[PDB]
Design a protein around this nucleic acid. Structure first.
Lengths: 93, 17, 46, 63, 13, 14
RNA sequence: CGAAGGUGUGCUGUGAGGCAUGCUGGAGGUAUCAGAAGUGCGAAUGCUGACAUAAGUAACGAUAAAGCGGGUGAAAAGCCCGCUCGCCGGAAGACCAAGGGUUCCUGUCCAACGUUAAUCGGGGCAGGGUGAGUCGACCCCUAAGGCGAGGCCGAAAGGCGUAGUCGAUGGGAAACAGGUUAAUAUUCCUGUACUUGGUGUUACUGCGAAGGGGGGACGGAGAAGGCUAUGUUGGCCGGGCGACGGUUGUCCCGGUUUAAGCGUGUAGGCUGGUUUUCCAGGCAAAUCCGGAAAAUCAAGGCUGAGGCGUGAUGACGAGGCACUACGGUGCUGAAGCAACAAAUGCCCUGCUUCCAGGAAAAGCCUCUAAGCAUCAGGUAACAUCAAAUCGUACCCCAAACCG
RNA sequence: AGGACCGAACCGACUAAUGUCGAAAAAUUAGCGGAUGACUUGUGGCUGGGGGUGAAAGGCCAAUCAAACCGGGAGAUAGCU
RNA sequence: UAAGGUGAUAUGAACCGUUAUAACCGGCGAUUUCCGAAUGGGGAAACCCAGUGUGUUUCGACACACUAUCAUUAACUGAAUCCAUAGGUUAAUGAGGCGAACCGGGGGAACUGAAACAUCUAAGUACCCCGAGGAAAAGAAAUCAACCGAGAUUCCCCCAGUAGCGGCGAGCGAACGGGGAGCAGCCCAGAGCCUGAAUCAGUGUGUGUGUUAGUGGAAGCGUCUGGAAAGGCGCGCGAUACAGGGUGACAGCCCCGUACACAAAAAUGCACAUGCUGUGAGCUCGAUGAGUAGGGCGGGACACGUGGUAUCCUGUCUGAAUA
């Protein structure tokens, strides 16, 4: 059983932006970064345990890294997955 | 500097026979 | 004026894809040659 | 911080790994992302500590 | 560099 | 904080 | 207190050359005598790089067209705003699939890129943006075709092919309306729905296949009927009566919109139902299909657009009012009907005709063998749970795809 | 009913002009032929070089075809420039 | 080993360490995602979808392991017919793929040369395919020689552009013999006596050597020119170390090195001695490789092109003697 440690690694970081702020104040939902796989069930369990909050539903999407032109060279950013988590009437963070 | 990759194909307007 | 190249990902992969080369021994030699030359792209990868 | 935990039993080794993963690994990561972490050297130090514990578990369990 | 995910997204006509 | 290398003499006006 | 190289000058030998030196240069060079050569360039329509010429010449890519005021700015014919003018309008509009791969939105900059300028941009830099049980992919099934355990054949490589397994351009369960972002929505929010499975409870019950049967399941052309999308007019509601004559009137302008689902069952189309008995047929069996007999009624059953109720005393709604970082935000909100016309769309994979005679398999329904029938399993109702993963930006007759 | 008729989309290319360092390595403008069929088109397959395919021109087989393209034999050979 | 470090472009931020677990180097271990022979099935490579068996927070759902094909072996099942066989399942062992050349084998050109061209040449070359090794192949005479003699194979220099072959054209081209490198001989087709009896292969121990980190390593100063001297000038010292590299111009004596003398907890190749395992010494007698040798037909290889053509190999048809 590695479910506990798995839940401690799916979550990577919160997402800060205008869309994130308006979603939180209006829809009571938090947007955060997750691992590349990060199935919806794992994200739901991780938020319930680590943040000790009740959740309703999770929506995930994959963001493709942009292609950047650094110096004389061309590079690409890494793809990452962000999840929208909808909390219930009781919210903490 | 660079060889034209395409060479136009001409025609014989004047048979000159 | 319709041109010779009409792109299609499915046709490109099924024709010159990695698995297409490995199916026959001639394709395997094509991969072997390009590994020896050190080419970054072994085949047309989606 | 290598031979201090060599002689502990497997039960404590799993316990210390869990709190290493739980605290100072997840919490530090959230702090760094939010910009509230100024001592970024803890992140690497904690990661190496987790590796050390896992190395002991393998040479303890089974083989 | 190479993107490998040309999945189909057909919006209902 | 990203280091910026020296660009070509016709570089952007940065 | 200045090597090679570079650049001038002065001497010198019949010559290829040599010697001394001014300035730049900045650390290597090499006598004499021998040795070995990638040992000497003006040509090869020689090869590579650089730079001339024509020449400040042709051209600046559809003859759809621009004019003015204000703003920003160092600078405005090209950017923003405003008022006119012109062009497309079965498209030069709005959507996709394929193909591109961040070109999308905001801030900022004008070197190069834009056939000119550029404050502008599909340009540079930074940040932001793609939310699904119902869309699609994935997945179940298969066509052409591919691969192919054994197998057959072939000097080797290998060819063909059975069982199988892949292969959508096809078949298979399910969501609509309104609102919202600078950029996503049938994915987010509000409202009202629907589909397939697991578990649990209750009442009944025989369940059970790669096996059988049904269904899925299909051509061309033609015609009529019933409809709807949609349009026009009248009524109704709100506003107007008007800088050049007239216009309270049969006058002018705008609006008059509302889904999926659920209930009803119609126009139309198809077929005769019900009960009993029997049969070497359906590679075994069968209550199923097929076939043969009788009795009985004359109806039943299947399919089916639209309409009508509910959905919805909800939403939307012209306009009005209050503030504008003066882009827009908030609040409020009347009428919301009828008639006529009408499709290439639906009833219709229908009907009537014609010869060229018009896929397959699964999902689904149904019958049994092996096996178990105090079980298991199936049916009906209720509760709960689950529906993962991937695509979702933007262009898409084009400046973003192939040239 | 029709390899029926007129005529758009769609498919093709008979004539003329323009264009030949073009907007374009075959196009534009004005006319022109077929337009329910031996039609046209999307997607996916199969046929491979002395071979394919061809309502047959030596046509087409990635802007190249009386024998495609790439690498090799190969620095082929050249009584010629 | 260590007073420095956290690889580079590439600075910074935040830190570790300084007498020893900072960092760095070497040995032995652990982790080792996904694709790829890819091997659970499939597939457009880095993706999709599973079955079975082991253990667990809300049934929810999780973690690990196994599951390809082929060949051999063993077990259990098992047809058309009794037996049987084919076939099926299970377990173990081995293989699969990649890699520059060299090696052996199976196929095999043309250009070109001949001043044309067909025999011939190019050439058994290029190329394709198969198999193995660190080398491979070949190898202990049914061989040469000449009636004097040598005794496995392989490689180099001669013999020798010789003898021959050849539209006797272009071209191809030996052998005998001699000088060298290196040398090693055996086993089965079978019984008896004697039975570890030598030599070998695999696993332990011990010595030596080498590889994988390293340690010490001599000796110069003053003036002149100059941005700076290692240069000029003057006087010294080291050298079993003036091989090289760096240092503000050219360094034996500034630094890293160099000759030289040492170093190994752990893993390793090589040469020996000592144990175990397995086949196996020595003597007598006998045996001593048959569809084979040879032959007819058609080809190929030997320098040798069918010629007077020996010898070898083979597709086809035949076919002995056996000391």
């Amino acid at each position: 059983m590695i479910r506990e440690e798995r839940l401690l690694k799916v979550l990577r970081a919160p997402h800060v932006s205008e869309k994130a702020s308006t979603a939180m104040e209006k829809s009571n939902t938090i947007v955060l970064k997750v691992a590349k796989d990060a199935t919806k069930a794992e994200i739901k369990a991780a938020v319930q345990k680590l943040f000790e909050v009740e959740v309703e539903v999770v929506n995930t999407l994959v963001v493709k890294g942009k292609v950047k032109r650094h110096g004389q060279r061309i590079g690409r950013r890494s793809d990452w997955k962000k999840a929208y988590v909808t909390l219930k009437e009781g919210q903490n963070l | 500097n660079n060889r034209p990759v395409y060479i136009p194909r001409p025609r014989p307007p004047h048979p000159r026979l | 004026m319709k041109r010779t190249f009409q792109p299609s990902v499915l046709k490109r992969n099924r024709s010159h894809g990695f698995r297409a080369r490995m199916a026959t021994k001639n394709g395997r030699q094509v991969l072997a040659r390009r590994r020896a030359k050190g080419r970054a792209r072994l085949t047309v990868s989606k | 911080m290598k031979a201090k935990e060599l002689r502990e039993k497997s039960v404590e080794e799993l316990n210390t790994e869990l709190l290493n993963l739980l605290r100072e690994q997840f919490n530090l990561r959230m702090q760094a992302a939010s910009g509230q972490l100024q001592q970024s050297h803890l992140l690497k130090q904690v990661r190496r500590d987790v590796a050390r514990v896992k190395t002991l578990l393998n040479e303890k369990a089974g083989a």
